[PDB]
Amino acid sequence: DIYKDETLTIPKGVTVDIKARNVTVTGPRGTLKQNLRHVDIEMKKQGNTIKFIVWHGSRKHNACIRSVYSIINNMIIGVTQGFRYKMRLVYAHFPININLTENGTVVEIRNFLGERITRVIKCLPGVTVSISSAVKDEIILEGNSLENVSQSAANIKQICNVRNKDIRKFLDGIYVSERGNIE
Template identity: 30%
Template sequence: MSRIGKKSIILPPGIQSHIKESYITITGPKGTLSYNLSEMINIQNENNQLQLSLIKTNKESKALYGLSRTIINNMVIGVSKGFEKKLEIRGVGYRCQMNNNNLILNIGYSHPVIIEPPKDISIEVEDNINIIVSGINKEQVGQIAAKIRSTRPPEPYKEKGIRYSGEIIRKKVGKAGK
């Protein structure tokens, strides 16, 4: 049985939850998120605490139990505080800039790479080499950050490319000369 699913989710002040059958909507100062629970999981709101419980006990429901609790907890954190991922660009001549709402990356290709964020995600550029992706949906923030990183992932020989802030890339030794 999942130990994560048993924990209750405490709603901070200013956060409302609306439960209609298996559909939950969380509203807060940053926005609104919703999620459709499985029919095998029941959710109740008691004294500003959300508690999940299993209706059926089988392998699939046990797997969804902890997952559902984590997704709902991330929704509560997202509408109250929000999420952000920071990326760094390293390499001679590599830089980025914002044009309207689009991110333009000049990262060693013959053409600039243009990334359009979804409407809920905001991208900021600092010093032409630091990128901050922020939003209320943790999954979308991580997906856009991974998409930006995948345009030029860090390579282990010269350590050039786009990496997450704080990510450690182990440098490999190049070819040994005679």
């Protein structure tokens, strides 16, 4: 074909700007900046919407068109509604210690199966994690950038990752159950 267009309506967020080849997406919760070098695609603004166009190309570039459409929409969800995820811990005999430091950025984790290894989980830039108080053994992490938020908890899931034991009997550990917006 000669055209491949997909447009998403811009919400009431503060900025849907794409100037200078960068995604400076600012909303009501805050401002987010991201590099727009995923692929040379036509980001065109039309009033209250931003149109993504891939004109006169093949599928190898056209398949990446929907990714930026999702990535901007993912940034739009963080700019407008944000992201708030809750991770649930499981303790059977030795409770796993957890200490939020640097406004919840430096997560001092210990006593995973009673181990003396000091597990320091440094949060990604722009995300704040906290121990949820409603449900025990629950950690609530929220932020604007969902990609940095999701990768941090996955890193937290990879922090106290069980090894050198049978996964069946040894089953208590760190898990993620709630993954949703901040609004």
